[PDB]
mmCIF file of C-alpha atoms in Angstrom:
data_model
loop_
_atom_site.group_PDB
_atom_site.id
_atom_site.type_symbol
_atom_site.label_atom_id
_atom_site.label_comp_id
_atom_site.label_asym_id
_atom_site.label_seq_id
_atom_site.Cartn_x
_atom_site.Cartn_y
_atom_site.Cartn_z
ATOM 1 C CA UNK F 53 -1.938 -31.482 -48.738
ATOM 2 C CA UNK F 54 -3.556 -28.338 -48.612
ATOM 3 C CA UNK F 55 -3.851 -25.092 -48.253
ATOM 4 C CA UNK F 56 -3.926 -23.274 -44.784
ATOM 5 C CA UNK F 57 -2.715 -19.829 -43.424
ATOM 6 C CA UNK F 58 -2.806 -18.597 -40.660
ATOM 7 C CA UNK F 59 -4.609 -15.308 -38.693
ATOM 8 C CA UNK F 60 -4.180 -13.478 -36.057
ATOM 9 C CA UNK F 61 -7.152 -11.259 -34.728
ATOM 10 C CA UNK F 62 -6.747 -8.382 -31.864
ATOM 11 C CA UNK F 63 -10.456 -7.634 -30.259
ATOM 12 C CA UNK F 64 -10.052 -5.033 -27.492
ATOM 13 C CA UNK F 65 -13.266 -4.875 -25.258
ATOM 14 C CA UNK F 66 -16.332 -2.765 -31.105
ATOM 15 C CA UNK F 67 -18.771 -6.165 -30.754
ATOM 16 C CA UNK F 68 -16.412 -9.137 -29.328
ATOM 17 C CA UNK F 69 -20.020 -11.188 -31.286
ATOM 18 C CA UNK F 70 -18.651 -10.056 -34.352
ATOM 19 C CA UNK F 71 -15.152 -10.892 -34.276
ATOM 20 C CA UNK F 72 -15.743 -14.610 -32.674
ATOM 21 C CA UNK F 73 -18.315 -15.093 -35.426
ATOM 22 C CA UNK F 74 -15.574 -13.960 -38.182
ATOM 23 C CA UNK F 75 -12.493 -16.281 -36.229
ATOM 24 C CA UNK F 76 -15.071 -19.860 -35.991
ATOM 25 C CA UNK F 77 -16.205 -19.309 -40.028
ATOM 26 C CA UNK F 78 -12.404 -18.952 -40.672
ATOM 27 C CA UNK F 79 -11.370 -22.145 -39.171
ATOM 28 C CA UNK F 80 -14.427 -24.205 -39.818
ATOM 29 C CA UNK F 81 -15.457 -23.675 -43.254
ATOM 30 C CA UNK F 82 -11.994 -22.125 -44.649
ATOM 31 C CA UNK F 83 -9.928 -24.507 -42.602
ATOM 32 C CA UNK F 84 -7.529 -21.719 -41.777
ATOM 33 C CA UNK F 85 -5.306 -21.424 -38.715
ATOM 34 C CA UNK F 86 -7.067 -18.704 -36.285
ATOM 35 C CA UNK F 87 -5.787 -17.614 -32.882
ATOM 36 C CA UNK F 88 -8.328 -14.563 -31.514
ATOM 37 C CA UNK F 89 -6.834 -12.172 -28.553
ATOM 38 C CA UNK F 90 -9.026 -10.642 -26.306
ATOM 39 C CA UNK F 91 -8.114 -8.202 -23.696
ATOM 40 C CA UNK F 92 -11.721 -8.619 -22.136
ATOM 41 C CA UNK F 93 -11.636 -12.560 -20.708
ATOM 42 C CA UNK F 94 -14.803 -11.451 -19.250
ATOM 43 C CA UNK F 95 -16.367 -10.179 -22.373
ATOM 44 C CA UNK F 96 -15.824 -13.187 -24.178
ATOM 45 C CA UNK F 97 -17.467 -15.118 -21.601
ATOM 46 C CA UNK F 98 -20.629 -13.120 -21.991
ATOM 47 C CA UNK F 99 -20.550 -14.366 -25.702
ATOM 48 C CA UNK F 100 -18.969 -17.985 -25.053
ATOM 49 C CA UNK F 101 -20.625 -19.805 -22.491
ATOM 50 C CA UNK F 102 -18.253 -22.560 -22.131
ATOM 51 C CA UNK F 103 -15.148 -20.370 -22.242
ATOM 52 C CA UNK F 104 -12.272 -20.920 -19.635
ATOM 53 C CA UNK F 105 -11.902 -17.280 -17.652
ATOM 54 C CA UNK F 106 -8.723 -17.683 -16.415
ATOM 55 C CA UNK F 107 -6.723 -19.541 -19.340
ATOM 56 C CA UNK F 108 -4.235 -18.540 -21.349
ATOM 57 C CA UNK F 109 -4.588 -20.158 -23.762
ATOM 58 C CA UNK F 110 -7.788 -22.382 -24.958
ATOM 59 C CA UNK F 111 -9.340 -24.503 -27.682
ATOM 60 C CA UNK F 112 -13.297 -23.396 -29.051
ATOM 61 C CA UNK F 113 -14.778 -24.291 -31.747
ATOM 62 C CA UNK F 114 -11.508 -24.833 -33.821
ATOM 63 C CA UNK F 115 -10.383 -21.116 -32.796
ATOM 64 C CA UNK F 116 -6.868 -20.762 -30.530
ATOM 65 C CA UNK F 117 -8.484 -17.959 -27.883
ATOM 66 C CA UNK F 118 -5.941 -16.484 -26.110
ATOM 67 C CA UNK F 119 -5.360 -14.250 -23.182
ATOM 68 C CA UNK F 120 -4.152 -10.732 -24.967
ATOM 69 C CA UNK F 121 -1.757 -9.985 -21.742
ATOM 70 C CA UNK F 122 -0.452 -7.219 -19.862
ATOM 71 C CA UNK F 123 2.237 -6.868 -20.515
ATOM 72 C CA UNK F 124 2.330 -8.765 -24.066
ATOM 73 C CA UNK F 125 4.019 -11.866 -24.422
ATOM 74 C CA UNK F 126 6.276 -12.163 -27.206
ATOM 75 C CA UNK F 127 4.990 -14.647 -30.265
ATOM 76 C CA UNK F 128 5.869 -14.869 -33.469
ATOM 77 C CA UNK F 129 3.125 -13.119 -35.819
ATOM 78 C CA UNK F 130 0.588 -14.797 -38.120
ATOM 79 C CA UNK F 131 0.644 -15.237 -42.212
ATOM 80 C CA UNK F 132 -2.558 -12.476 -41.355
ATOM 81 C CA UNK F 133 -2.943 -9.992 -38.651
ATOM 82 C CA UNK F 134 -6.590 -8.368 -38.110
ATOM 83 C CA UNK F 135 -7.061 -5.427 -35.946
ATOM 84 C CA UNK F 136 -11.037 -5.511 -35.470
ATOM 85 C CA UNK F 137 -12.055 -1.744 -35.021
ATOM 86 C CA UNK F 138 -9.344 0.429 -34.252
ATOM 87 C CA UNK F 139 -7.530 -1.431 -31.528
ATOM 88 C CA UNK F 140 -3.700 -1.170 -31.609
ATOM 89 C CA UNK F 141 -1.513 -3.851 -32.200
ATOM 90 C CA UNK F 142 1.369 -4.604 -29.250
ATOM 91 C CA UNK F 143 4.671 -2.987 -30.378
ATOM 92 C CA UNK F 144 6.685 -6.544 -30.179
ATOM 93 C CA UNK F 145 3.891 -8.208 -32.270
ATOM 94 C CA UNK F 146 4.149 -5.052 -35.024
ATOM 95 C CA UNK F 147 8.289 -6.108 -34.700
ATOM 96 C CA UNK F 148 7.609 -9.951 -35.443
ATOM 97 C CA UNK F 149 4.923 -8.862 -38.259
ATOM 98 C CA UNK F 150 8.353 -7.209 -39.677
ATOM 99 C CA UNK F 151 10.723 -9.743 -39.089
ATOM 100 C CA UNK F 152 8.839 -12.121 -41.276
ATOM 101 C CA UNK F 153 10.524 -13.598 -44.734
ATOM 102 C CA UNK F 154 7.142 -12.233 -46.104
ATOM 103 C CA UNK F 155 5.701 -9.847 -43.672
ATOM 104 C CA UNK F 156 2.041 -10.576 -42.326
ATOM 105 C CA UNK F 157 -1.017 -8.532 -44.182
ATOM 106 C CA UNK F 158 -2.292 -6.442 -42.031
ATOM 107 C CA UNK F 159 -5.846 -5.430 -41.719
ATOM 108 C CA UNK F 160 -8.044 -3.207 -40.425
ATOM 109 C CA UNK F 161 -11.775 -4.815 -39.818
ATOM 110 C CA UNK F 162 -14.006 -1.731 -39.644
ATOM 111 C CA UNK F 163 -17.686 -1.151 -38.751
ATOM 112 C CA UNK F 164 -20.269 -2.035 -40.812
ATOM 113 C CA UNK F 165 -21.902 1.285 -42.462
ATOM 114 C CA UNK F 166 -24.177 1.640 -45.360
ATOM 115 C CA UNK F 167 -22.784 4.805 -46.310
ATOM 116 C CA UNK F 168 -21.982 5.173 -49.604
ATOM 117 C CA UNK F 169 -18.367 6.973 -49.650
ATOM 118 C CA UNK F 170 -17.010 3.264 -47.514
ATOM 119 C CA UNK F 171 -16.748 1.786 -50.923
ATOM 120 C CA UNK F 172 -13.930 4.135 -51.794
ATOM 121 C CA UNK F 173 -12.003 3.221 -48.696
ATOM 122 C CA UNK F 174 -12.693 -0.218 -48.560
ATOM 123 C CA UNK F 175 -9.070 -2.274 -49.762
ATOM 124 C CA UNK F 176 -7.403 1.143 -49.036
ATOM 125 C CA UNK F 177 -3.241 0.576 -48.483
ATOM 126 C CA UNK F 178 -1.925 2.837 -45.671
ATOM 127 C CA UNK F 179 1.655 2.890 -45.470
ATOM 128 C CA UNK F 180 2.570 2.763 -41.812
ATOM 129 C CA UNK F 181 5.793 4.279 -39.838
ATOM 130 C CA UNK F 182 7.508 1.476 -39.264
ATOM 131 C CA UNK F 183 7.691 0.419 -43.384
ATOM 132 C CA UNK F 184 4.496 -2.025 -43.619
ATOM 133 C CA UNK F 185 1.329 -1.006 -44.810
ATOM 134 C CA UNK F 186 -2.204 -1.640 -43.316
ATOM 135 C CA UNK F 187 -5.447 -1.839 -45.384
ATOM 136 C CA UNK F 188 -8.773 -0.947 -44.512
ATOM 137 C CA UNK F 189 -11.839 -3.963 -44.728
ATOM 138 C CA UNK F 190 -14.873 -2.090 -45.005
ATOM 139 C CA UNK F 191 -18.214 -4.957 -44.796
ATOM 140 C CA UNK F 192 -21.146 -2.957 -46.065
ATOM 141 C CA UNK F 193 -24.193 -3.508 -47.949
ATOM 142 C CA UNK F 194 -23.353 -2.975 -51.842
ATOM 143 C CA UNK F 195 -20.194 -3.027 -54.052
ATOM 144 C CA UNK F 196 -17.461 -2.082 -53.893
ATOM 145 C CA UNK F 197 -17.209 -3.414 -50.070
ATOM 146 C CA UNK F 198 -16.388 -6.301 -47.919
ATOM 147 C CA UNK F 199 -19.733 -7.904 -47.312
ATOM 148 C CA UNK F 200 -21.723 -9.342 -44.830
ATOM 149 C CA UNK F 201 -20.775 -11.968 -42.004
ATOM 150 C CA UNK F 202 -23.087 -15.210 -43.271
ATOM 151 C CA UNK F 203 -22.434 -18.731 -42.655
ATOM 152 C CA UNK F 204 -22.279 -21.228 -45.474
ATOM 153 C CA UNK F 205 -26.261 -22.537 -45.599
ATOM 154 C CA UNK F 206 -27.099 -20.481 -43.449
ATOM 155 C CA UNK F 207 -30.534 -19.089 -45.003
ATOM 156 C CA UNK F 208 -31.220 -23.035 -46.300
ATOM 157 C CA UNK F 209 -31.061 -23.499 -42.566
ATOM 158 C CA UNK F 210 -33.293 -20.474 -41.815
ATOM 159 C CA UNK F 211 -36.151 -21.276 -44.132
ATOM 160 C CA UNK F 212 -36.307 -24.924 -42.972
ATOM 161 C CA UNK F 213 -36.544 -24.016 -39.686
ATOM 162 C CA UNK F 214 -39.493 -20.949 -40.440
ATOM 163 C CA UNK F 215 -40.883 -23.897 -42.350
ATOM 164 C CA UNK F 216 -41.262 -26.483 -39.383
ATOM 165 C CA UNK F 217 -44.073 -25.717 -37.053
ATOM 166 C CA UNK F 218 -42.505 -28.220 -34.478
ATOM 167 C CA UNK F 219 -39.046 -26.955 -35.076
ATOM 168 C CA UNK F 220 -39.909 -23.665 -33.528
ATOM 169 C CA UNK F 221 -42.561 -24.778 -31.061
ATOM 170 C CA UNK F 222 -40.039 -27.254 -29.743
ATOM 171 C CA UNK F 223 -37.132 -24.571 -29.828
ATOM 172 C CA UNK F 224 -39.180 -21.740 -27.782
ATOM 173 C CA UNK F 225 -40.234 -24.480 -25.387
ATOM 174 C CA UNK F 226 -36.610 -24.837 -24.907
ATOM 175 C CA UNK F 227 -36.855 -21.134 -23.765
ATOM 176 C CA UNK F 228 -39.639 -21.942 -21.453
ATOM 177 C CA UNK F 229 -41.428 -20.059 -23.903
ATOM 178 C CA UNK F 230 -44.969 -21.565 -25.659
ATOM 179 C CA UNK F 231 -46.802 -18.779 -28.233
ATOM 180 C CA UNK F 232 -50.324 -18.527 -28.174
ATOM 181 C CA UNK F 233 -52.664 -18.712 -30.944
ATOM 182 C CA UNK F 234 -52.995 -15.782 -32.755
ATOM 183 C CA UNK F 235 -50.041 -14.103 -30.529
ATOM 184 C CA UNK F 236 -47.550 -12.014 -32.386
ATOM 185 C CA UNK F 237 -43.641 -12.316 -30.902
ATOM 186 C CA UNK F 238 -41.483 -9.762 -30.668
ATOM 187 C CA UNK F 239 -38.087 -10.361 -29.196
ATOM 188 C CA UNK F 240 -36.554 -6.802 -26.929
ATOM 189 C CA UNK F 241 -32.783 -6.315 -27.154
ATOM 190 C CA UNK F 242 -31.705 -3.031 -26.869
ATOM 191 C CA UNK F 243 -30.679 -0.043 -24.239
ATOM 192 C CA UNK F 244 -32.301 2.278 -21.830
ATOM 193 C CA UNK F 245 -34.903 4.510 -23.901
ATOM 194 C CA UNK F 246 -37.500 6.717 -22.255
ATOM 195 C CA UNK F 247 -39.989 6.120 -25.409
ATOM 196 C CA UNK F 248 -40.302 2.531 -23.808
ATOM 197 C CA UNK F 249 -43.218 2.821 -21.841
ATOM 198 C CA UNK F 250 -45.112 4.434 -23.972
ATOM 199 C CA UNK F 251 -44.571 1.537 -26.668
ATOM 200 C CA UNK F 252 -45.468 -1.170 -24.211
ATOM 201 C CA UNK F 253 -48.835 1.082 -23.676
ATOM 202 C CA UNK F 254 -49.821 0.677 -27.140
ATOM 203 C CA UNK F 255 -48.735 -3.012 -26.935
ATOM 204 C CA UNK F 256 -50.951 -3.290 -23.732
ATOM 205 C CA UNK F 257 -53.914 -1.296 -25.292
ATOM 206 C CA UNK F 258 -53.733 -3.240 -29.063
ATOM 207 C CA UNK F 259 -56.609 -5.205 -30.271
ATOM 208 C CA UNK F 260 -53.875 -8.052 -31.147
ATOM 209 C CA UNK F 261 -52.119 -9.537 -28.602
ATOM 210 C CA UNK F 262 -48.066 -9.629 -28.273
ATOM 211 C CA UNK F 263 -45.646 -11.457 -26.295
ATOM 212 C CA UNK F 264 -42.953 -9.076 -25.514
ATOM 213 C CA UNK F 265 -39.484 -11.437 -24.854
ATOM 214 C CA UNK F 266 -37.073 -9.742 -23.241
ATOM 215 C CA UNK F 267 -33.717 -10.400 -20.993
ATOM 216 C CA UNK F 268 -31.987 -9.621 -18.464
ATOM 217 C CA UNK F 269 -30.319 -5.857 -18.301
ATOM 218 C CA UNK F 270 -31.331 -2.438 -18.135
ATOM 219 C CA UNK F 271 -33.975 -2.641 -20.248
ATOM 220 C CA UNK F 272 -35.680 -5.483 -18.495
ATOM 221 C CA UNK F 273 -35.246 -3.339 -15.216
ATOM 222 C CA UNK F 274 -37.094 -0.550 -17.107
ATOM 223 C CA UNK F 275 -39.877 -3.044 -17.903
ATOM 224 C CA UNK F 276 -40.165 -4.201 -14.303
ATOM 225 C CA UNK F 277 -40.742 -0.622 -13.578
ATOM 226 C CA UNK F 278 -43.601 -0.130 -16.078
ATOM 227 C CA UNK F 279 -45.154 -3.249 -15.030
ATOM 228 C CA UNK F 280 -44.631 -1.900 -11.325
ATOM 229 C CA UNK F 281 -42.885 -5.524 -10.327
ATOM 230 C CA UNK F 282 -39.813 -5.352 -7.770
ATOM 231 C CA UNK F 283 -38.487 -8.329 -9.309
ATOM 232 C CA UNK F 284 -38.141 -9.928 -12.898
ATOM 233 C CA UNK F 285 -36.653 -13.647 -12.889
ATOM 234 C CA UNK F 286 -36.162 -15.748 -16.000
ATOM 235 C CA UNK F 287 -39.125 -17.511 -16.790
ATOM 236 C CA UNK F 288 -41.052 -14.761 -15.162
ATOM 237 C CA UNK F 289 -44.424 -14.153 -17.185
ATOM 238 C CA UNK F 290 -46.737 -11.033 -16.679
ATOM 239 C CA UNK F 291 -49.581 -9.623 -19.064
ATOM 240 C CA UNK F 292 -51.317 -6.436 -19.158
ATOM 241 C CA UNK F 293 -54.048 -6.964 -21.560
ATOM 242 C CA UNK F 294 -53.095 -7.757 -24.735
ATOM 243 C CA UNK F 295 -49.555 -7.486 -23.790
ATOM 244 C CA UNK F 296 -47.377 -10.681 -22.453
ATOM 245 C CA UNK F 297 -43.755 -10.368 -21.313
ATOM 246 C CA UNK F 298 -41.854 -13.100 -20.510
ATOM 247 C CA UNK F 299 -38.280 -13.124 -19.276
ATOM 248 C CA UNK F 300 -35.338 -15.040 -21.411
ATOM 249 C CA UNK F 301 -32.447 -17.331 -19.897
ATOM 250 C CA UNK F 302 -29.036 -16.385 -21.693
ATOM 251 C CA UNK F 303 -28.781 -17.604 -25.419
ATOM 252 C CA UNK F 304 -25.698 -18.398 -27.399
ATOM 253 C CA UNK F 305 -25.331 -17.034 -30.745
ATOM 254 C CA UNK F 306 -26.869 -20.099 -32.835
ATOM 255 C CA UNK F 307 -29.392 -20.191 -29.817
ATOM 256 C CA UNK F 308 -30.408 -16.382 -30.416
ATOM 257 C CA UNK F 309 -30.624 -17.284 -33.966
ATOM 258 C CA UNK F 310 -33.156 -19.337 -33.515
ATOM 259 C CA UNK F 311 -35.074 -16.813 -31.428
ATOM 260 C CA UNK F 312 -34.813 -14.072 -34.011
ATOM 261 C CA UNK F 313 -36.066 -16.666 -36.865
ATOM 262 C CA UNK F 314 -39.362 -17.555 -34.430
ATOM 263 C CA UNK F 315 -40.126 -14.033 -34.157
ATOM 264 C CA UNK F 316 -42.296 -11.490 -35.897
ATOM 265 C CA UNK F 317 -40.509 -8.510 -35.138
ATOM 266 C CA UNK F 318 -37.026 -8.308 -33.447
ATOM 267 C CA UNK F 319 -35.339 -5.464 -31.638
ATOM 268 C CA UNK F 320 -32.579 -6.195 -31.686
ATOM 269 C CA UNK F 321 -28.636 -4.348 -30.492
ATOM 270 C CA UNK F 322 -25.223 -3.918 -31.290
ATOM 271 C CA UNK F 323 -23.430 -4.370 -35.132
ATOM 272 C CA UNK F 324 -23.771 -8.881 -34.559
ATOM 273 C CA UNK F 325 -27.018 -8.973 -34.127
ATOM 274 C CA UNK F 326 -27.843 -6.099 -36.503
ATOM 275 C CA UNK F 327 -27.346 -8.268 -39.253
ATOM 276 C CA UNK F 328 -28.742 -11.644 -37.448
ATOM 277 C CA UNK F 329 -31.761 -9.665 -37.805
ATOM 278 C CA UNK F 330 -31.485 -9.031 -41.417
ATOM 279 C CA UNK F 331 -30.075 -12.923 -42.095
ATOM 280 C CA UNK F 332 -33.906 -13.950 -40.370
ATOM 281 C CA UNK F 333 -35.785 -12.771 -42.865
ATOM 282 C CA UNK F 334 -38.384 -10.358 -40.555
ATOM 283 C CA UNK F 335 -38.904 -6.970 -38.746
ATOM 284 C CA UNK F 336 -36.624 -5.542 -37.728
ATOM 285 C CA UNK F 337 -35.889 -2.269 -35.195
ATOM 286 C CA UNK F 338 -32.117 -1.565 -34.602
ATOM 287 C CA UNK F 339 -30.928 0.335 -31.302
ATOM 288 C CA UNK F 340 -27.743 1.893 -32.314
ATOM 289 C CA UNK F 341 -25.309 2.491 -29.405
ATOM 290 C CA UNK F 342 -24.559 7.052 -35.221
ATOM 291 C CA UNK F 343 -27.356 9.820 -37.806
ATOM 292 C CA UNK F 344 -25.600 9.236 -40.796
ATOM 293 C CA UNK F 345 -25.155 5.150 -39.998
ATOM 294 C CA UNK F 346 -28.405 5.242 -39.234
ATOM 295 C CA UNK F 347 -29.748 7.634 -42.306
ATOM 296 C CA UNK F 348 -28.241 5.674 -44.258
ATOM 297 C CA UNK F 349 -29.369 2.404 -44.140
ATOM 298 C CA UNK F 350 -32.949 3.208 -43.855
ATOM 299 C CA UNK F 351 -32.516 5.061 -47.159
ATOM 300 C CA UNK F 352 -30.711 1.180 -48.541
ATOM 301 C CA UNK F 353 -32.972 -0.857 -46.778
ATOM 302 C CA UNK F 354 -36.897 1.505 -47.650
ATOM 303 C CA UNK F 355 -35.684 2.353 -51.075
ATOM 304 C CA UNK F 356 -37.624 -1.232 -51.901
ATOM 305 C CA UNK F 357 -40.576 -0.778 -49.817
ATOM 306 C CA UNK F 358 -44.129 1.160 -50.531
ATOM 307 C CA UNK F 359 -43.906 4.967 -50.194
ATOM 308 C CA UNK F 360 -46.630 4.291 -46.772
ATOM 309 C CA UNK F 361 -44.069 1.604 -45.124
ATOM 310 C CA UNK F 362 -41.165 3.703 -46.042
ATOM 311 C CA UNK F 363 -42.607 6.576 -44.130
ATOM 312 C CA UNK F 364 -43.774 4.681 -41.208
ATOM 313 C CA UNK F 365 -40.380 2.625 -40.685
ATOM 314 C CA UNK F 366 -38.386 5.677 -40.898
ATOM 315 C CA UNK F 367 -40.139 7.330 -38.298
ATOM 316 C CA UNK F 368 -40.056 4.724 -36.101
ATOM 317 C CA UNK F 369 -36.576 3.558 -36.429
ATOM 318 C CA UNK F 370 -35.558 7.501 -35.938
ATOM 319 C CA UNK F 371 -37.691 8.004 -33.098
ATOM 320 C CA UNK F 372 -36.683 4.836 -31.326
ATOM 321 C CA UNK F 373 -33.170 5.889 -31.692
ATOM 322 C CA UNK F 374 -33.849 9.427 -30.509
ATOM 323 C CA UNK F 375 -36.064 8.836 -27.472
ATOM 324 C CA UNK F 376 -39.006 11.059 -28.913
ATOM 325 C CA UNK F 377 -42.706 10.714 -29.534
ATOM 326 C CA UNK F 378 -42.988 6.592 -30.886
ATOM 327 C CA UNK F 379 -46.784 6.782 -30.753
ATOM 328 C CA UNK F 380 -47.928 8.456 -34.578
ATOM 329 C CA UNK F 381 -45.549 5.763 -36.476
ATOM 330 C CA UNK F 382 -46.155 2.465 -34.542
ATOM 331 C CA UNK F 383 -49.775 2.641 -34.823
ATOM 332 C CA UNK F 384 -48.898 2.663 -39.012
ATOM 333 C CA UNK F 385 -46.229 0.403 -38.840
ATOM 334 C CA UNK F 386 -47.932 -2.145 -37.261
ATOM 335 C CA UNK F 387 -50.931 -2.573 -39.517
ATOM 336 C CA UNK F 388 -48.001 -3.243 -42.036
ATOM 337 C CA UNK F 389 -46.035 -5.887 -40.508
ATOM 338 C CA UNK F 390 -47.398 -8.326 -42.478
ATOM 339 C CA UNK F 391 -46.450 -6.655 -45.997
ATOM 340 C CA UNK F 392 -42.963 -5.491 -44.195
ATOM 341 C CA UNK F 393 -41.981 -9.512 -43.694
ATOM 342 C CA UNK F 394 -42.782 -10.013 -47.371
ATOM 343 C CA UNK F 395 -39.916 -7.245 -47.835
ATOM 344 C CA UNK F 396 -37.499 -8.266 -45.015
ATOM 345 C CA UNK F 397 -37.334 -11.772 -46.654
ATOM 346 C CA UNK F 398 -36.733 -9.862 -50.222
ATOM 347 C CA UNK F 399 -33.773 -8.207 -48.531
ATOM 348 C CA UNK F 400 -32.482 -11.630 -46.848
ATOM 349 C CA UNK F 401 -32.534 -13.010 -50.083
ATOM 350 C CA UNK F 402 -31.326 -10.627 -51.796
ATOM 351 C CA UNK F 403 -28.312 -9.907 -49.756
ATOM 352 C CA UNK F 404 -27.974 -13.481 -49.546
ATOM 353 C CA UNK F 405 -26.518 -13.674 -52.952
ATOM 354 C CA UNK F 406 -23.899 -11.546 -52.369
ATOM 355 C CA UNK F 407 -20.252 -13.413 -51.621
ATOM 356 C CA UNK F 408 -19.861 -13.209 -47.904
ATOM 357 C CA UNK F 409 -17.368 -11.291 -45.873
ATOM 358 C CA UNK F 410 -15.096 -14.267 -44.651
ATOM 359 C CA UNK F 411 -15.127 -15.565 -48.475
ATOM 360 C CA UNK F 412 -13.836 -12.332 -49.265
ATOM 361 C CA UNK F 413 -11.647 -11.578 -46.683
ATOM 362 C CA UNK F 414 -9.797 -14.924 -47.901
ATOM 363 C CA UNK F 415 -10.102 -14.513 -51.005
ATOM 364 C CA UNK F 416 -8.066 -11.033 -50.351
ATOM 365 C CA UNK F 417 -5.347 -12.598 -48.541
ATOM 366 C CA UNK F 418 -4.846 -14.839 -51.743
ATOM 367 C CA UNK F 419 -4.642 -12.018 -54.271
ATOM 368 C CA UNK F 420 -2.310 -10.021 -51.718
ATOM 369 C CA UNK F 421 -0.164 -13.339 -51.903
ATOM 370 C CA UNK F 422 -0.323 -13.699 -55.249
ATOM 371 C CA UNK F 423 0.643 -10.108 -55.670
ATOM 372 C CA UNK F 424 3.372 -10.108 -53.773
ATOM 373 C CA UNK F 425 4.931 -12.275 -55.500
ATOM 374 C CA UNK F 426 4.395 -10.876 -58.772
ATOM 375 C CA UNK F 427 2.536 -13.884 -59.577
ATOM 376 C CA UNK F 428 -0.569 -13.980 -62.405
ATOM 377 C CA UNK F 429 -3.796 -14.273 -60.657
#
């Protein structure tokens, strides 16, 4: 015997990547039962390869994914139900949540902020209309708060892979990608900007060279135009002086992983991949799709670093985010990469010995239990 609950999560398409990461760590390393319901069968596919479009109903990775239809389908509710950012909940399923000898929890999985007032919120009760009350999750970046995503090993994993040569050789080869000597990487995830081309100019007209990867999408069109190509395949390799660009084939999130732990600076998109970054230990620029989010964790995440790097990463980040002049802070910021990845392992480590966010969101369904019931804890 043991112990297993199970959870219901909505996901109406905040970052589908974030919710399918939280449903997989439930069922693999917690063991719990997890159906996930996305209204989006197409946006799932973008971050499940191997999904089924058109099923109802389907089996991945331990998780029940299932078709969130229109009109609902009446099911009887789960021990836990999540609503990931802000989506609302069918009527019939907020009717079985009720009918329930002992009513599900109900949650509300919010976006990650480093803001400081989230950890006065985060745990909050909200008593709802209909008699059952809702409470706010709140990850974030220091106590009180709900945590980060991070799978069990998961830096263990990371530092024997940035330890293995061949590991990542072999990996980016898989990629159709091979580094050359003396080459720095830096991976290109993010949206439109017009401060683009004049980046890739001082990538182009550096005394070190860079290979720029980048995929498919907007931004890659944008690229094509600055490199003046019609077309831009995967595989696709063009360099402008010290400049490379190559284009990526679609990764998978343990696949992408692997990209952002080969690479010396990642730009990288979206709340997922936000943290990815952070988990891999390096450079970082974040593209949010937002001032205070944004103001916030750069004063978190600099107040560790050298008064110079501070300065210089601020800039950037706020410039890149803003579409303005990018030329003044990259020339700084890159002369410091190398003391910046001594820092951006600091963090990884450091946040690394924090209790995750599935461990905690667990571990708050058994005190809800436990309270309840009146029990001792």
């Amino acid at each position: 015997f043991q112990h297993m609950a199970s959870w219901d999560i909505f996901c109406s398409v905040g970052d589908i990547g974030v919710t399918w990461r939280l449903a997989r760590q439930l069922a693999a390393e917690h063991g719990q039962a997890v159906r996930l319901w996305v209204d989006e069968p197409q946006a799932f596919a973008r971050i499940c390869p191997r999904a089924d479009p058109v099923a109802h109903v389907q089996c991945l990775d331990g998780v029940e994914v299932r078709a969130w239809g229109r009109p609902w389908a009446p099911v009887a509710a789960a021990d836990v139900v999540i609503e990931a950012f802000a989506c609302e909940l069918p009527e019939a399923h907020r009717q079985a949540m009720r009918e329930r000898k002992r009513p599900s929890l109900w949650l509300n999985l919010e976006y990650l902020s480093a803001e400081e007032w989230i950890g006065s919120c985060h745990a909050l009760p909200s008593l709802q209309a209909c008699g059952l009350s809702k409470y706010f999750f709140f990850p974030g970046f220091r106590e009180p708060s709900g945590g980060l995503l991070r799978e069990a090993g998961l830096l263990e994993r990371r530092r024997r892979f940035q330890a293995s040569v061949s590991a990542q050789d072999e990996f980016l080869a898989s990629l159709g990608v091979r580094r050359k000597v003396g080459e720095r990487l830096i991976s290109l995830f993010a949206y439109e900007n017009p401060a683009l081309p004049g980046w890739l100019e001082q990538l182009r007209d550096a005394r070190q060279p860079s290979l720029l990867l980048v995929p498919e999408g907007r931004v890659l069109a944008d690229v094509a135009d600055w490199l003046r190509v019609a077309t831009l395949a995967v595989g696709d390799v063009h360099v402008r002086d010290a400049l490379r660009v190559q284009v990526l084939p679609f990764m998978a999130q343990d696949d992408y992983d692997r990209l952002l732990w080969c690479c010396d600076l990642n730009a990288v998109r979206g709340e997922d991949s936000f943290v990815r970054a952070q988990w891999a230990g390096r450079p970082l620029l974040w593209h949010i799709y937002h001032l205070a989010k944004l103001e916030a964790f750069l004063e978190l995440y600099c107040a560790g670093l050298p008064a110079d790097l501070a300065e210089n990463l601020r800039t950037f980040w706020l410039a890149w985010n803003a579409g303005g002049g990018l030329a003044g802070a990259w020339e700084g910021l890159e002369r410091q990469l190398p003391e910046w990845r001594r820092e951006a392992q600091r963090w990884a480590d450091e946040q690394g010995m924090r209790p995750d966010l599935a461990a905690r969101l667990v571990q708050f369904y058994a005190d809800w239990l436990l309270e309840h019931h009146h029990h001792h804890h």
